[PDB]
Coordinates of N, CA and C in Angstrom, one line a residue:
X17 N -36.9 -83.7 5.5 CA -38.2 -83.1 5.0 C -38.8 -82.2 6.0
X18 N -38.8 -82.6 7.4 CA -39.2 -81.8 8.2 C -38.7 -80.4 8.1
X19 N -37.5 -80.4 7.9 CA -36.7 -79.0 7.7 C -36.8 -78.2 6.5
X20 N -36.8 -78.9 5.6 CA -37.5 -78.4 4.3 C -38.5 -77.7 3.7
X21 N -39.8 -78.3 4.8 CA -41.1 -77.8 5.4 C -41.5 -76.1 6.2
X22 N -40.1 -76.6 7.2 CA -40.2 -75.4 8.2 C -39.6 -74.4 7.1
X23 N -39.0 -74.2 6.3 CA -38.3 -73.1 5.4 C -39.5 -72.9 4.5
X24 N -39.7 -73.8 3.7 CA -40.8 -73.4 3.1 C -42.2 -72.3 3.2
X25 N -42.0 -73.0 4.7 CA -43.8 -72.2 5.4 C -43.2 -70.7 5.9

């Protein structure tokens, strides 16, 4: 999820 997060933003 953390990484998920960072792609997202």
């Amino acid at each position: 999820l953390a990484e998920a997060l960072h792609r997202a933003l």
